[PDB]
Amino acid sequence: MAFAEDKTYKYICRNFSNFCNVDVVEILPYLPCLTARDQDRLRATCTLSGNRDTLWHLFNTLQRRPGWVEYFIAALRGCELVDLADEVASVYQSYQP
Amino acid sequence: MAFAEDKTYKYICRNFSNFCNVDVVEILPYLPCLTARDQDRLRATCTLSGNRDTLWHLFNTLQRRPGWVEYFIAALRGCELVDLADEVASVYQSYQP
Amino acid sequence: MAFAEDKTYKYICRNFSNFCNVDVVEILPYLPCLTARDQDRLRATCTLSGNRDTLWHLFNTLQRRPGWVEYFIAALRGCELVDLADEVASVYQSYQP
Amino acid sequence: MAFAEDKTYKYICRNFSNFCNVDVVEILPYLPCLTARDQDRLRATCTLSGNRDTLWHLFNTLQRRPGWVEYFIAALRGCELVDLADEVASVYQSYQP
Amino acid sequence: MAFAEDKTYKYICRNFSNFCNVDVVEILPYLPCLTARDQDRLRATCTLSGNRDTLWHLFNTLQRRPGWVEYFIAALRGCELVDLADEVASVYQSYQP
Amino acid sequence: MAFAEDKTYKYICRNFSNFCNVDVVEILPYLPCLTARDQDRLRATCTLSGNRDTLWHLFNTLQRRPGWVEYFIAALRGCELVDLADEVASVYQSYQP
Amino acid sequence: MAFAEDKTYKYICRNFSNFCNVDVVEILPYLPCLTARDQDRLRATCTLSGNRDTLWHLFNTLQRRPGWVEYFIAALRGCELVDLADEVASVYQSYQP
Amino acid sequence: MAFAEDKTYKYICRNFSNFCNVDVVEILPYLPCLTARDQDRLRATCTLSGNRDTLWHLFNTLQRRPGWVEYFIAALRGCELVDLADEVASVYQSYQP
């Protein structure tokens, strides 16, 4: 649900600092939900501002597509950030009926 | 119909908080109904004031030209805001004969 | 002469919509007739209200100091608005003895 | 003609989404009509704002100089956007006497 | 307490110049008390107007949400602005019962 | 003394044009004597109306609260308008017992 | 009730200075009871005259239309002025039979 | 002298178009007269608005500190803009007693 998605995103920003390792350029191919465009923005942002900065735009960009959370859990798993994926899914499923 | 357009726009502000996602700078390319001026007015506003803020200016500008609702529904769809577009179209059709 | 200058400015507003192409910030480097303070006013206006809009405020500012017309034709030529400059000069010289 | 160029640009924005593949940084060397300065602005915008995005600034920037459409048709052809140039040229010549 | 928060914010502005290093874009991610939007406004402002400048909008923006002081002290510590955090917390606790 | 402060402001406006250098948006952070409101008023004034214009509104605002002179002299020094500050302090101390 | 709404508003002005945090430009999107023309006036006022100032004009406009209190309490909540919303509702319900 | 500096700045704007080659990001390190902060503004402006545009803010920014002309001449010389440096210095000494 959107309410769950929205609460997830709120969690992530609560805890953004922990996430870091998340690699924007690595993570994007796993997010076909993002506009073929919006990836460019993130990917170009990263060149300019460095990863961890752009990470913030990406999540804000990620939470933009209904259904995004499932995409993301998949993404971290593609990124072998399994412990992180497990961390969000916990948060995510916590807000589902 | 206009009655439908105004009810649509009136709906939009009622439920604006939900819309949140529309990316001003993103959606404008789909809205050739808007004044070549007024698009500059939006984006420069976007630069000065940030996105969601500029969003509001965009809608008020949008509802100014006859036919905008179809333009808008098309726009959201290019922005893959399908659920958002489907939501608007519903509100729109609901007011058609 | 002033009569020519005034007829020119009146021409410009009577054909204002046609000019648009003029970029205000650029009309600004080439135009030392404008007060060091009024350029700030325009550009800040330009940022705030967008270009075409700011253009009108720009011309309105420009026609205030004797000699502005020569400055302007030079400016467009610096902006490679040669056909535009050629148009004004014609309009301008049409009002010279 | 001015009228023909303008309809083209209005056509382009009607159909902008289709254009996308157009590469701003690639296309700029082919546009000596654009100000040596403006290219910088597009090229820097592109770095800041991403390609398809800056694309929009570019067309709006391109249509700024009379004669631009031929420059543009030439450009697409230099960019092996033969199908695109043919698409535009069609639109352009459709508006010439 | 509210009284403590305001005295703190008044202190911050008393002593703003010392703060400078504080990086708006770096520090915002630690500040979920700020609206997901007002960070855009700070950040877009930051892009437009520069860092230390936006720092100011941010503090005025930060002091907007009850409980913000705790949020800020935490943030600076994450920004390894330990001496700064120590400095404010000192100011802060000085105004609590 | 109050008598000293007023002669100073009368000095400032009688020499207002000389000051310009003072950057309105820049100087405000040094002036906590100003109401947390009134800074909004100046800056917003600055944005719509431009700097030197706003300077007058700034000075006009500043001279309203007792003690402002010490604040202002300090401010200019923060703005490294040392010669400007030196000029005012001279004017200021010239009117003290 | 209308009387309850009025009693709330007098509370507001007697405590107006406290309530300035309300960000005018921010709050309007939650208030569809306001006349679509009349919001422009607030923002135009807000921009011209600054926020806290505009708050008062906003309130005076808001209390014009019956039912506004529910609109407002909701509004603050959207602004995560939960404590502020919590403050008003108390004052409000204290005046209902 | 101040008289000399301003006449130079006026010259600079009267010939600004000629100057362009001046590279903002390159030139700033040679100007410790500008506030370490205003470099950010220029350096960030260059980013948003392009190099030709920011040069303009820079000179107006440069002419802001008494003594700036010597700094600028030094700077251009640091920038191997020897012909440019000779051009300005000539203009400068032309207004000294």
Curated annotation (Swiss-Prot), chains A, B, C, D, E, F, G, H:
Residues 10-77 are annotated as: Required for interaction with NLRX1. The modification N-acetylproline is found at A2. The phosphorylated pLxIS motif constitutes an IRF3-binding motif, leading to recruitment of the transcription factor IRF3 to induce type-I interferons and other cytokines. Ubiquitinated. Undergoes 'Lys-48'-linked polyubiquitination catalyzed by ITCH; ITCH-dependent polyubiquitination is mediated by the interaction with PCBP2 and leads to MAVS/IPS1 proteasomal degradation. Ubiquitinated by RNF125, leading to its degradation by the proteasome. Undergoes 'Lys-48'-linked ubiquitination catalyzed by SMURF1. Changing C79S: Loss of palmitoylation. There is a cross-link at K7, K10 (Glycyl lysine isopeptide (Lys-Gly) (interchain with G-Cter in ubiquitin)). It is found in: Mitochondrion outer membrane; Mitochondrion; Peroxisome. Signal peptide: none annotated. Residues 10-77 form the CARD domain. Changing E26 to A/R: Impairs filament formation and abolishes antiviral signaling activity. A lipid is attached at C79 (S-palmitoyl cysteine). Present in T-cells, monocytes, epithelial cells and hepatocytes (at protein level). Ubiquitously expressed, with highest levels in heart, skeletal muscle, liver, placenta and peripheral blood leukocytes. Adapter required for innate immune defense against viruses. Acts downstream of DHX33, RIGI and IFIH1/MDA5, which detect intracellular dsRNA produced during viral replication, to coordinate pathways leading to the activation of NF-kappa-B, IRF3 and IRF7, and to the subsequent induction of antiviral cytokines such as IFNB and RANTES (CCL5). Peroxisomal and mitochondrial MAVS act sequentially to create an antiviral cellular state. The pLxIS motif constitutes an IRF3-binding motif: following phosphorylation by TBK1, the phosphorylated pLxIS motif of MAVS recruits IRF3. IRF3 is then phosphorylated and activated by TBK1 to induce type-I interferons and other cytokines. Self-associates and polymerizes (via CARD domains) to form 400 nM long three-stranded helical filaments on mitochondria, filament nucleation requires interaction with RIGI whose CARD domains act as a template for filament assembly. Interacts with RIGI, IFIH1/MDA5, TRAF2, TRAF6 and C1QBP. May interact with FADD, RIPK1, CHUK and IKBKB. Interacts (when phosphorylated) with IRF3; following activation and phosphorylation on the pLxIS motif by TBK1, recruits IRF3. Interacts with NLRX1. Interaction with NLRX1 requires the CARD domain. Interacts with PSMA7. Interacts with TRAFD1. (Microbial infection) Interacts with hepatitis C virus (HCV) NS3/4A protease; this interaction leads to MAVS cleavage, thereby preventing the establishment of an antiviral state. This is Mitochondrial antiviral-signaling protein. It comes from Homo sapiens (Human). The chain holds residues 1 to 97 of 540 of the full protein.
